[PDB]
Amino acid sequence: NSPYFEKVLGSLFARQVEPAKDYAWDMGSTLPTPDDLMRRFIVKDTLITIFRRHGAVEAPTATLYPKSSHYGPNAVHLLDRNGTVLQLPCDLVMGHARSLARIASGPVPQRAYSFGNIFRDRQDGGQPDVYGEVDFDIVTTDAMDLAMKEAEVIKVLDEIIAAFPTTSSTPMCFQLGHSDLLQLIFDFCNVEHGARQAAAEVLSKLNIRNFTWQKVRSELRSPLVGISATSVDELQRFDWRDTPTKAFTKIRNLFEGTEYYDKVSSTLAHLKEVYEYSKKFKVNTKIYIAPLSSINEAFFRGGILFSCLYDRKVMDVFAAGGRYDSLIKAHRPERHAVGFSLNWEKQLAKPQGIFSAKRCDVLVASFDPSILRSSGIELLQMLWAHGISAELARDARSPEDLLTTYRDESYSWIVIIKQESQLKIKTMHRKDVPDADIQAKDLLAWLKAEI
Amino acid sequence: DPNSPYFEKVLGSLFARQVEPAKDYAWDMGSTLPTPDDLMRRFIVKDTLITIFRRHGAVEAPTATLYPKSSHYGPNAVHLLDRNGTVLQLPCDLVMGHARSLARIASGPVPQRAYSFGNIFRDRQDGGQPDVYGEVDFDIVTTDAMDLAMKEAEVIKVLDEIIAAFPTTSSTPMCFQLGHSDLLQLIFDFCNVEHGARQAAAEVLSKLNIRNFTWQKVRSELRSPLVGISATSVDELQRFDWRDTPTKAFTKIRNLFEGTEYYDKVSSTLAHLKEVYEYSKKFKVNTKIYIAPLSSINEAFFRGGILFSCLYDRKVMDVFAAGGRYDSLIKAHRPRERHAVGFSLNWEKQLAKPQGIFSAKRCDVLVASFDPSILRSSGIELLQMLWAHGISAELARDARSPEDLLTTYRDESYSWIVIIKQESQLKIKTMHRKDVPDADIQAKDLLAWLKAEI
Numbered sequence: 001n002s003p004y005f006e007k008v009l010g011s012l013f014a015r016q017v018e019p020a021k022d023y024a025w026d027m028g029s030t031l032p033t034p035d036d037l038m039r040r041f042i043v044k045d046t047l048i049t050i051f052r053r054h055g056a057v058e059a060p061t062a063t064l065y066p067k068s069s070h071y072g073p074n075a076v077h078l079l080d081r082n083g084t085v086l087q088l089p090c091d092l093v094m095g096h097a098r099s100l101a102r103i104a105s106g107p108v109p110q111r112a113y114s115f116g117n118i119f120r121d122r123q124d125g126g127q128p129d130v131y132g133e134v135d136f137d138i139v140t141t142d143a144m145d146l147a148m149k150e151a152e153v154i155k156v157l158d159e160i161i162a163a164f165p166t167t168s169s170t171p172m173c174f175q176l177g178h179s180d181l182l183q184l185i186f187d188f189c190n191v192e193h194g195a196r197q198a199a200a201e202v203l204s205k206l207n208i209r210n211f212t213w214q215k216v217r218s219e220l221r222s223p224l225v226g227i228s229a230t231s232v233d234e235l236q237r238f239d240w241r242d243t244p245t246k247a248f249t250k251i252r253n254l255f256e257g258t259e260y261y262d263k264v265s266s267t268l269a270h271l272k273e274v275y276e277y278s279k280k281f282k283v284n285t286k287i288y289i290a291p292l293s294s295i296n297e298a299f300f301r302g303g304i305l306f307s308c309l310y311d312r313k314v315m316d317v318f319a320a321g322g323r324y325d326s327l328i329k330a331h332r333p334e335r336h337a338v339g340f341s342l343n344w345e346k347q348l349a350k351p352q353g354i355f356s357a358k359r360c361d362v363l364v365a366s367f368d369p370s371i372l373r374s375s376g377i378e379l380l381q382m383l384w385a386h387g388i389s390a391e392l393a394r395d396a397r398s399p400e401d402l403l404t405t406y407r408d409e410s411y412s413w414i415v416i417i418k419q420e421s422q423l424k425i426k427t428m429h430r431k432d433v434p435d436a437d438i439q440a441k442d443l444l445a446w447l448k449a450e451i
Numbered sequence: 452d453p454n455s456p457y458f459e460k461v462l463g464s465l466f467a468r469q470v471e472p473a474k475d476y477a478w479d480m481g482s483t484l485p486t487p488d489d490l491m492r493r494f495i496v497k498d499t500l501i502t503i504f505r506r507h508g509a510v511e512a513p514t515a516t517l518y519p520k521s522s523h524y525g526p527n528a529v530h531l532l533d534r535n536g537t538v539l540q541l542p543c544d545l546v547m548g549h550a551r552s553l554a555r556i557a558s559g560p561v562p563q564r565a566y567s568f569g570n571i572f573r574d575r576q577d578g579g580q581p582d583v584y585g586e587v588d589f590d591i592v593t594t595d596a597m598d599l600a601m602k603e604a605e606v607i608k609v610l611d612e613i614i615a616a617f618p619t620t621s622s623t624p625m626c627f628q629l630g631h632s633d634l635l636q637l638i639f640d641f642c643n644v645e646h647g648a649r650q651a652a653a654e655v656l657s658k659l660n661i662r663n664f665t666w667q668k669v670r671s672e673l674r675s676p677l678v679g680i681s682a683t684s685v686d687e688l689q690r691f692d693w694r695d696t697p698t699k700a701f702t703k704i705r706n707l708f709e710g711t712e713y714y715d716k717v718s719s720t721l722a723h724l725k726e727v728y729e730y731s732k733k734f735k736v737n738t739k740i741y742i743a744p745l746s747s748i749n750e751a752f753f754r755g756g757i758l759f760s761c762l763y764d765r766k767v768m769d770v771f772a773a774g775g776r777y778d779s780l781i782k783a784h785r786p787r788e789r790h791a792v793g794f795s796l797n798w799e800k801q802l803a804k805p806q807g808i809f810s811a812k813r814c815d816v817l818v819a820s821f822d823p824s825i826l827r828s829s830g831i832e833l834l835q836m837l838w839a840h841g842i843s844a845e846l847a848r849d850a851r852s853p854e855d856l857l858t859t860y861r862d863e864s865y866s867w868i869v870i871i872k873q874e875s876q877l878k879i880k881t882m883h884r885k886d887v888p889d890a891d892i893q894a895k896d897l898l899a900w901l902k903a904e905i
Contacts, residue, residue, distance in 0.1 A: 001471075008461040013530055013538055015453050021537050022519050023786055026555040034562040037510040044511075053838045055814035055845040057490040063516070063541070063570055063583070066470045066478055078539070079532040082578055083465050084474045086531070088516070102479045109487045111845070117516060125535065130516070144848075148827070155835070280831040333476050360508030373601070377733040384506045384612070385735075391508040391564070394597065 001083070009083055024125030038359045039349045043164075044115070046354055047344060050159050051113040051136060054152070059109065059137075061116035062095035064088055070298060076121045076128045088119040088128065092135045092341060093299055093324055100139065101331035108335070111152075112137050131346070137339030147270055150304050150323060150338045151277030157308050157319055157340060158283045164348050165355070167318065172285045173311035175241055176274065177293020179300050179322075180267045181251075184260045185291060189234035191227055198225045199235075200294040206239065208315055213239050238291045244275045247289035274304065286311075301326040304338070318347055358389070358412055358429070365393035365402055366417040375417050379440065386444060399426075413450075415443070462536055477578040489803070491813045493585075496617070496803045497568070500587060503612045507605070509564035509589065515548035517541055523751055529572045529581045541572035541581065544795055545588040546752055550777055553592065553791065554784035561789075565590050584800065590793030600723055603757050603776060603792050604730035610761050610772055610794055611736045617802050618809075625738045625771065626764040628694060629727065630746025632754050632775075633720045634704075638744060641713050642687040644680055651678045652688075653747035659692065663767055666692050691744045697728045700742035727757065739764075754779040757792070772796040812843070812866050816901075819847035819856055820871040829871055833897065840898060853880075867901070 032040070048058075067077055067087040076088040089095055092114060100108070113136045119128040136156050138149040154174060161167045182203075186196050202219045205211040213236060220227045220235070227235075237254060241247070248268045255264045271289060278287060285308075293305045295317070303323025310316045321340030328335055364380050366372040376392055383390040396402040399416065406414075416424040421440045427433035427450070438446050485493070501511075520530055520540040529541040542548050545567060553561070566589045572581040589609050591602045607627060614620040639649050655672045658664040666689060673680040673688075680688075695703060701721050708714040724742060731740060738761075746758045748770075756776030763769045774794030781789050818834050820826040830846055837844040850856035853870065860868075870878040875894035881887035881904070892900050 005461060005465070008457050009465070012458060012462065012532060012536060015458070015536065015538065017519050017537060021535060025519055025537075026552070029552070029556050030558040031552065031556050031561060032513070034510065034560055037512060037562060037565075041510050049841075053841065053843055055843055057487060057494055057813060059490065060485070063572075065580070066475045069469075077466060077534065079462075079465055081530060081574075082474065083468075084470060084478075084578075085466060085468070098479070099482075099484065102476075103482050103484050106484055107487060108484060109490060112490075119516075127515075127518070130513075145827075148831075148846075159838070277831065280828065281835050282832075359510060373598075374733065377601075377730065378735075381608070381733070381735045387502075387506065389506050389508055392601075 005083065009081070012079075013081060021125055025127050027126070029127070034359075036349065038357075039351065039355060040345060042354050042357055043344055043348045046163055047134060047160065048113070050156065050163060051111075053159075054111050054156065056111035056113050056136065057109050059096075059112040059114050061092055061114050062089070062099065065095060065098060068094055070094075074120045076119045089116060090118055090120075091296075092116045092118065092133050093296075093327065093339065096135065096137060096339075097299075097324055097327040097337070098331050100328045100335045100337060102333070108139050110139055112139065131343055133341055134344045135339050135341050137337055139335060139337045141335055143336065146323065146336065146338070147273040147304075148277050149336075150274050150306075151281055151283075153321060153338050153340055154274070154278050154287075154306065155281040155283055157342075158281075158285050160319075160342075161285055161308070163354075165353050166348060166351075167310075171311040172318070173309050174283075174285060174287045175290035175293055175307050175309060176244075176271055176287060177290050177305045178267050178271060179297055179302055179305060181264065181271075181291055182294055182297055182305070184255075184264050184267070185235065185238055188255065188258065188260055189231045191231050191235075195225055195227055197298060199227060200297040203235075203292050203294040204296070206292060208309075208317060210314055235292070241288040241290040244272065244287065244289050247291070248272065251289075251291055271304070295320040296322065299324045299327045306340075308340070318342070358410055360389050360391050360409070361412040362388060362390035363393050363406065363409070363411045363414045364390055364417070365396060365414060367396060367398065367402075368418070369395050371417050371419070375421070375440075379415065379417065379423075379443070382443075388447065399424075413447070458536060462532070462534065466534060474578055478580050480579070482580070487813070492805065492809060493799060493803045495808050495811060496798060499616050499808055500613065500798065500802075501566070503609065503616060504564075504566040504589060506612075507564050507609065509566050510562050512549075512562060512565040512567045512590075514545055514567050514569040515542070515552060518548060518551055521547055523547070527573050529574045542569065543571055543573075544749075545569045545571070545586050546749075546777055546780065546793070546795060549588070549590065549793075550752075550780040550791070551784045553781045553789045555786070561592050563591060563593060565592065584797055586795055587798045588793055588795045590791055592789060592791040594789065596790055599776075599790070599792075600726035601730050603727050604734055604736075606774060606792055606794055607727070607731055607740075607759065608734040608736055610796075611734075611738050613796075614738055614761075614771075616808075618807055619802050620771070624764040626762055627736075627738055627740045627759055628743040628746055628762060629724055629740060629757065629759045630743055631720050631724055631757050632750050634717060634724075634744055635747055635750060635758075637708075637713050637717050637720070638688070638691055641708065641711065642684045642691075644684050644688070648678055648680055650751060652680060653750040656745050656747040657749070659745060661762075661768055661770060688745070694741040694743040697725065697740065697742050700744070701725065704742075704744060724757070748773045749775065752777045752780045759794075761794070771801055812864060814843045814845050814863075815866045816842060816844035817847050817860065817863070817865045817868045818844055818871070819850060819868060821850055821852065821856075822871075822873075823849050825871050825873070829875075829894070833869070833871065833894065836897070842901065867904075869897070 064086045067085045071090050075090050078086045080086055115134050117130050118133050119130055121128050138152060161172050191199055202216055206216055217232050220232045255261045295307050300322030303325055305322040307320040308318045310318060319340050319342035323338040325336045362383055364376050366376050380390055380392055396405060412429040414426040414428055423438055423440055424435055426435050517539045520538045524543050528543050531539045568587050570583050571586050572583055574581050614625050644652055655669055659669050670685050673685050708717055728740060748760055753775030756778060758775040760773040761771040772794045776792040778790045818830050820830050834844055834846055866883045868880040868882055877894055878889055878891050880889050
């Protein structure tokens with residue numbers, strides 16, 4: 001920070017945009033389709049209904065903050081006028097953990113959900129790729145009942161699984177693990193500390209999308225990690241999952257006679273308590289212990305780790321989470337938190353069900369332009385005042401051409417105005433209901449009758 | 452020279468330094484979160500807003516987070532550099548990012564009616580993170596210029612529906628003030644305001660009669676050499692410092708332009724505003740509408756189109772919301788098709804900062820028990836039962852007596868408290884009304900007992 005550094009800086013901020021860069025920023029960009037935005041709205045609304053059941057309010061998310069040493073070159077890095085290097089979020093937990101550690105003493109909600117954007121940086125002058133994330137978090141100010149709170153987060157995911165068509169009839173499972181278990185397995189297997197973060201990162205793909213143990217062992221023995229053949233064969237003794245009571249037994253036997261047995265046992269007791277509470281919450285998706293669980297383990301140091309998976313032959317991640325007390329502490333220049341993160345638009349939005357809801361229930365139409373723009377409007381505003389969703393049609397010559405113009409919409413009813421305050425109603429949410437002429441004073445009563 | 456190697460050298464260098472620690476703690480020293488009360492009120496407001504929007508068939512559209520800086524903003528804008536040295540900004544409003552995307556995405560279909568929630572940012576000087584405010588926009592976007600005034604009246608109607616829905620506004624007097632960018636420019640011609648000063652003139656005029664900024668304060672700022680409008684022009688502009696209802700106001704404007712070239716030029720513009728007023732009546736807009744010929748809020752965004760503000764029509768006036776038709780801001784982004792009209796509203800400051808909508812509870816039922824072990828067994832069991840029947844409920848902390856529990860939760864407000872006792876027995880304290888006595892029921896009956904209380 002010499003006088004050199006600061007004059008060039010203010011000069012950088014007065015430089016005019018290279019036109020080629022201004023075009024590169026959004027060349028080729030698209031907007032989601034209008035039906036996409038309607039499926040997004042249904043999903044977001046369904047999700048919020050679930051969270052609110054638990055007494056959860058929505059919390060805000062930080063838009064940007066001083067960069068984290070933890071991320072590689074996929075993070076979007078930005079310089080402000082003081083020269084400090086800031087980033088856009090790669091996940092929501094980093095910002096929330098920072099908040100919990102820096103924001104002055106105050107009451108925070110114990111249960112909270114948040115919708116935010118996360119960003120992957122591009123190299124070709126284009127704007128960053130954006131993705132939607134949703135988190136649900138339970139934040140407490142004492143170490144009382146940490147396992148109960150963790151079971152509640154699992155329960156929320158199970159409720160999500162039940163409410164959506166893409167998950168509620170697909171085989172689904174949870175895999176539970178724990179940071180202390182993973183680090184004791186690492187001690188047991190004599191993995192050097194310098195290699196453990198990359199080891200955990202490789203292990204986070206295990207049995208996901210055909211990344212089988214053979215693939216894992218290649219990456220672990222490669223220069224990308226550098227673990228010895230002896231250490232990798234010992235880690236392989238933990239490449240399994242099982243139901244909790246069996247799993248605890250299998251793990252205790254692996255560690256029998258070692259200096260790690262006591263600390264492993266402590267850890268298994270906590271995982272058992274989370275299993276007990278999940279039965280009391282009546283979690284319906286099956287639960288396994290997977291001792292090499294490791295998704296984002298760096299954020300969950302000392303805490304539980306869990307993933308929610310599509311339990312088909314080739315498995316895929318649906319959501320993941322963990323207890324990230326330690327990520328709060330690492331930001332301290334007496335709060336605890338557990339939660340999950342989920343890419344709801346990818347897992348649930350991208351495709352008689354919840355998606356049967358209509359963007360708009362009533363199209364108000366008419367084949368007289370002047371009737372459309374007088375009586376059409378009065379009907380329209382009357383529907384809105386009674387809570388009914390409606391919009392005005394464009395001009396049209398005949399019902400043949402009106403239904404042709406609106407091929408790509410789905411209404412419950414089309415209401416056609418004609419002379420002498422008479423309406424024709426085409427029922428569109430059902431294909432066995434003929435058209436009917438009613439007096440306009442009767443439109444409300446006619447609608448309430450068909451619901 | 453922008454082709455100067457000092458530029459790379461300092462960029463690469465500065466992206467490689469690690470955060471000066473004092474700067475890391477300054478970013479959020481003493482930053483405060485909303486209270487849990489604030490958060491439930493923000494949830495209620497946002498929910499009422501979305502109910503109004505969905506009535507019109509609107510869906511939520513995403514908003515851009517950042518983009519190359521615009522020259523339309525002052526030093527308030529948050530500026531940031533990416534690794535190429537491109538200067539980017541955080542938004543100061545949602546219309547800029549929306550108009551850019553409409554111009555640059557090309558692509559295909561766009562929802563006709565859309566709302567969006569987004570953050571806007573004011574820069575600071577003290578190394579603290581920027582101030583953030585929450586904005587909501589409602590926009591009508593079409594590929595055809597058909598029924599232009601009708602779409603504009605719907606946006607006005609939406610604001611009228613919002614006024615009716617919130618106690619903040621439903622009782623207090625409100626008014627709409629409509630103008631038009633062509634009217635404003637024609638007034639600038641007639642008053643002989645030099646083209647080079649018109650942008651500064653409209654920025655000053657956008658404060659007129661807001662928060663005590665009377666005309667004499669307006670005259671001060673236009674005469675000052677920063678702006679430099681002649682005293683003869685400022686007095687001719689004063690001939691337009693008024694508002695009237697539409698028919699009267701159209702008449703005053705024709706009288707003022709009578710016998711000049713501008714009589715005929717303003718004519719088509721006055722007809723457009725007349726059509727918007729009449730579609731307002733058809734939409735049953737209750738808030739009174741004035742024509743204010745010097746309307747100029749963000750006029751740079753609304754060249755060639757209507758402008759309008761929604762005001763607290765008290766003695767001293769303030770802005771509730773504002774907007775206009777920004778076809779031309781879309782056109783200004785075309786690299787060298789789309790028409791859009793909408794409003795923007797700082798919904799947290801206007802509606803969320805304090806039956807009624809704000810009576811709804813964050814949590815309906817507190818599940819409690821004075822036996823620690825019952826709390827953590829049947830407590831949890833009752834809890835998931837409720838959640839499976841759509842009822843909001845949370846578990847209580849340990850408590851020795853109801854005196855203890857009721858005050859541990861003194862700063863909370865439930866509609867029922869449920870105390871589990873030995874056997875399948877519940878003691879229920881009704882908490883919304885203070886005239887209902889405690890009733891002991893069977894656990895097997897909690898559902899029907901609640902269904903029969905609402």
